[PDB]
A paper describes a structure:
MAT (methionine adenosyltransferase, also known as S-adenosylmethionine synthetase; EC 2.5.1.6) is the only known enzyme that synthesizes SAM (S-adenosylmethionine), the principle methyl group donor and precursor for polyamine and glutathione synthesis. The function of MAT2A is further dependent upon an interaction with the auxiliary subunit MAT2B, encoded by the MAT2B gene. MAT2B is present only in mammals and bears no sequence homology with the catalytic MAT1A/2A subunits, but instead harbours signature motifs of the SDR (short-chain dehydrogenase/reductase) superfamily. MAT2B was proposed to modulate the catalytic activity of MAT2A by lowering its Km value for its substrate Met and the Ki value for its product SAM.
Residue numbers in the entry:
A (entry chain B), B (entry chain B): 27 to 338
Amino acid sequence: MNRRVLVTGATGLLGRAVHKEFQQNNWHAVGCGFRRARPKFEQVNLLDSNAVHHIIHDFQPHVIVHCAAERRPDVVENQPDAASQLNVDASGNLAKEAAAVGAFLIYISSDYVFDGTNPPYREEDIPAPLNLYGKTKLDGEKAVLENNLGAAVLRIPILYGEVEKLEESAVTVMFDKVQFSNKSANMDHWQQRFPTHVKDVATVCRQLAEKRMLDPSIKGTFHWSGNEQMTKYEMACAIADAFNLPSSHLRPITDSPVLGAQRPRNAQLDCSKLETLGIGQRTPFRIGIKESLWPFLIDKRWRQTVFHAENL
Amino acid sequence: MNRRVLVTGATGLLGRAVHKEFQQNNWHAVGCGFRRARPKFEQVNLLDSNAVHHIIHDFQPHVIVHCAAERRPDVVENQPDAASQLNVDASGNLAKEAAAVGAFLIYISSDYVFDGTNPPYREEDIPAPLNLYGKTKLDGEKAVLENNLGAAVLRIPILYGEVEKLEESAVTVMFDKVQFSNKSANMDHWQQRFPTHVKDVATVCRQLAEKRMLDPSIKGTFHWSGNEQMTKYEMACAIADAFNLPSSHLRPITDSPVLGAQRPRNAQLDCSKLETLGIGQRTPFRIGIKESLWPFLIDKRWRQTVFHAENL
Ligand SMILES: NC(=O)c1ccc[n+]([C@@H]2O[C@H](COP(=O)([O-])OP(=O)(O)OC[C@H]3O[C@@H](n4cnc5c(N)ncnc54)[C@H](OP(=O)(O)O)[C@@H]3O)[C@@H](O)[C@H]2O)c1
Ligand SMILES: NC(=O)c1ccc[n+]([C@@H]2O[C@H](COP(=O)([O-])OP(=O)(O)OC[C@H]3O[C@@H](n4cnc5c(N)ncnc54)[C@H](OP(=O)(O)O)[C@@H]3O)[C@@H](O)[C@H]2O)c1
Ligand SMILES: Oc1ccc(/C=C/c2cc(O)cc(O)c2)cc1
Ligand SMILES: Oc1ccc(/C=C/c2cc(O)cc(O)c2)cc1
Ligand SMILES: Oc1ccc(/C=C/c2cc(O)cc(O)c2)cc1
Ligand SMILES: Oc1ccc(/C=C/c2cc(O)cc(O)c2)cc1
């Protein structure tokens, strides 16, 4: 489309895919990053209200896709006031600036706003976050929707895609456990997950934006999710199957974990609202994960002691 | 050549170029990294003696080019025992393992081992480091040459090349000062520097390795440097000239700085020993820097307030 789009968090796992989607569909796509921004992207600290103000009013975007967030529970628990400032305050300020320029803001939220006791969750179901991250994401939605009426909230589950490091994604972190066949690996078989490709969420954003460019009623809360239900165990096995690797060493743990009280068992998102717009894309997990992980597939060759016990 | 080469610090500024040089010249090049290793390279902590031992004896390299180091004076001063462990202890252990496999080790050193009072410095001139970094690099040479007789030390000056971030290189960090023409910039015109392209140091490593594969006398201390003498000011102006940008805003400071007592004024390296082997390559600074920085050249376009005073 002949429109301008600004993508916050363009250096991140989802942001990279959102920027690619828009750009490849001939939008004037401008991406934002921070530590990893330059040279590919704009270096804008979302915590600096003036920088945010200046790039938005200079670029004059039609759409703003807000991906930038603190999603790491290690940083959200250790630095709770820095997490709130980025996941809540920065989003709210972005909504104020989106409103001033007349830009359609898409706030990216999480399935972690729900307690995962009563799936599937419809957009207008009561959120009950069991962790501070979900609470910051929930308070982020409230901040966005308070300061910008026409904004949209897109709730999505566990993401995977082309990663810079295996730790960039909760699905991709377990690749090494699957590759070290000599050592038994304990894998969660309790929490129900819906692995979603960032490529597919990026399509949903572009489509939603493109719908809004013709229909002013495209606003509010939306849910997007992959339709393949999987536990971390089933995922680990699916990864093994994709690469034709053994999964005999992988042990399922059906029991609720120690931190299980702070994690939603099944926060399944009902996607009927978006499906009502004809919006959506679903890359089969076995295809998507193979695309994502093949560079990290260790070719032993000369590496005789690489799979050694005291190495990871 | 039909030989195997292991490059430590392959993720770093110099390491990336050394690995490319060897690989492009049909060597069996295997690169090592740490935080940025995967998927392109091997993840080996040089501080873990077992990991170092295992990769060296598995790969059985003919040559080892040791680039990995703590070169940041901010980390060398704040964490002096972690800097010594990597710049000294890890190098020495690498020399012990190079010796055990019968691999030609090239230790990359610095012009900062000299006090820069009596240039040009010949390889057998007395080193006198004015800072802890230079002292760790000097003690690194001693560690290497003590534990491996046949090893080579390659002393090089200020490096530049294709950077991931402008901060990756002391030459490239000043690009933003050169680009912000609206603000006057104070540039050092005291310390004499010899900006050297990593591409050119990488050629010198390959050539030295290839010479050693036929001549067992290729060992000891060597010096490599670009032949263009420049102060940070002259460099900043040369960068401006390369891109056809004004340099009127750039102010030279001929006076010795506050930290000037800890920096060698002119640690010019005499390269006659390598020139005696027919070794060397010299990319003209104006060509080399243009290749290195063009991705970081800001195209204003819609970015009206990007060059604003309260932004950098
Ligand atoms: N990852 C999942 O599994 C998943 C599941 C549901 C929803 N989400 C939601 O998805 C959204 C997307 O993020 P992600 O998963 O792709 O996370 P991400 O990989 O962690 O990336 C985070 C992004 O935040 C940017 N950022 C952080 N601080 C910034 C600052 N001060 N100024 C400007 N930018 C800053 C980063 O920039 P630099 O790196 O350049 O510094 C990076 O681009 C998030 O809102 C998240 O809550 C995550
Ligand atoms: N840069 C200059 O201007 C210049 C001038 C003269 C000589 N030097 C000398 O040139 C050599 C090359 O380095 P550089 O300038 O290219 O520096 P660099 O960019 O700082 O890169 C340092 C490298 O060190 C690796 N490393 C650090 N800790 C490690 C560990 N614990 N295990 C394995 N690898 C580790 C890094 O890996 P990860 O990033 O993957 O973690 C990175 O590859 C250095 O020895 C330096 O002293 C520098
Ligand atoms: O390595 C990692 C650190 C944190 C995360 C976040 C995972 C996640 C999973 C969901 O169902 C919803 C959500 O908002 C976030 C993933 C990988
Ligand atoms: O304590 C340890 C025991 C074994 C190892 C194996 C290391 C290793 C790392 C590589 O990238 C390739 C390889 O062939 C071997 C490391 C540490
Ligand atoms: O951003 C930076 C932090 C540290 C450095 C190191 C510079 C340097 C310059 C020399 O003449 C010799 C040397 O060993 C190192 C460069 C850039
Ligand atoms: O305090 C401040 C005053 C001005 C600015 C300018 C920001 C900016 C950043 C971009 O990547 C593009 C742009 O057009 C403008 C930032 C902070």
